Design a binder for this molecule. Sequence first.
Ligand SMILES: CO[C@@H]1O[C@@H](C)[C@@H](O)[C@@H](O)[C@@H]1O
Ligand SMILES: CO[C@@H]1O[C@@H](C)[C@@H](O)[C@@H](O)[C@@H]1O
Ligand SMILES: CO[C@@H]1O[C@@H](C)[C@@H](O)[C@@H](O)[C@@H]1O
Ligand SMILES: CO[C@@H]1O[C@@H](C)[C@@H](O)[C@@H](O)[C@@H]1O
Ligand SMILES: CO[C@@H]1O[C@@H](C)[C@@H](O)[C@@H](O)[C@@H]1O
Ligand SMILES: CO[C@@H]1O[C@@H](C)[C@@H](O)[C@@H](O)[C@@H]1O
Lengths: 90, 90, 90
Amino acid sequence: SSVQTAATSWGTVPSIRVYTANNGKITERCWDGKGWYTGAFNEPGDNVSVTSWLVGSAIHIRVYASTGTTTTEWCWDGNGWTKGAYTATN
Amino acid sequence: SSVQTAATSWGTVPSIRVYTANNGKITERCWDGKGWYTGAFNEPGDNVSVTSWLVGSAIHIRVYASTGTTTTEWCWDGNGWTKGAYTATN
Amino acid sequence: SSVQTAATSWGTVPSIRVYTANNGKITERCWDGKGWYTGAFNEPGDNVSVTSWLVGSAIHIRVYASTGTTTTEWCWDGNGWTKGAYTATN
Ligand SMILES: CO[C@@H]1O[C@@H](C)[C@@H](O)[C@@H](O)[C@@H]1O
Ligand SMILES: CO[C@@H]1O[C@@H](C)[C@@H](O)[C@@H](O)[C@@H]1O
Ligand SMILES: CO[C@@H]1O[C@@H](C)[C@@H](O)[C@@H](O)[C@@H]1O
Ligand SMILES: CO[C@@H]1O[C@@H](C)[C@@H](O)[C@@H](O)[C@@H]1O
Ligand SMILES: CO[C@@H]1O[C@@H](C)[C@@H](O)[C@@H](O)[C@@H]1O
Ligand SMILES: CO[C@@H]1O[C@@H](C)[C@@H](O)[C@@H](O)[C@@H]1O
């Protein structure tokens, strides 16, 4: 019905990422202290969750995008978004 | 049908905040080690996400509240809740 | 019928937990740096959120599981999942 969001943040600036699932597409908005901008994340899904962790100053993000019973993990490790090994039996 | 929640926590006590979206209104329950109480956050939304970060011992919280395609950011930085600069274009 | 997910992570290995609400049941998938495996968490809910915090190297997790207007908190504190004191009046 309404759009569905997930958010994560890191450091003390801070950096924030907000994922929005909207009519079966998930997009990303980004804050690194200098204003909101559109991020590179673009994947299909009706539902989104996210978690992230720092290794020093390098951010690692995992976005979990679901359509039906299939959840697909997407990984940011500094070098673009790549499909992760996550599987489930839903 | 069911209500929809988002949660964040910080420190080692810990402090926890649970946001619940219910029939278009989001409310807040709080734990700081001494029992659950109703927090000050009260905003419209059908969907809620949240993230938080520490700057030293000072907590900062961002709650993302959505109704239809409009997501509104709310900010706690120690001194009450204020509308954030987040915009999307959904 | 789309599933709904929540995620948390900790440390820098990292450890990740992904909770999936699916036809009124919430299940758990786990990563601690080897493969993905099925976790012990199994509770009723149409909606799930989660937060976690470290006390030293010991993980503490709180999962908020909602069915209708009733949100139930589940606690991992290193030995097993136990019902938490969380209440709300939804
Ligand atoms: C630098 O690129 C921005 O930040 C990264 C951590 C990701 O969230 C990416 O999609 C976004 O466009
Ligand atoms: C190195 O493996 C990648 O990162 C791990 C933290 C997990 O998210 C895994 O599913 C992913 O493919
Ligand atoms: C001190 O006030 C309590 O904690 C703050 C961090 C906020 O979550 C606020 O809504 C709540 O009432
Ligand atoms: C300083 O700006 C405020 O805090 C930032 C971390 C962002 O959440 C932004 O939208 C908000 O207006
Ligand atoms: C050791 O047990 C595994 O990890 C714990 C932190 C919990 O996530 C539990 O459900 C899971 O099976
Ligand atoms: C010790 O109390 C347990 O842990 C706290 C951090 C809260 O989650 C509370 O609801 C729970 O019963």
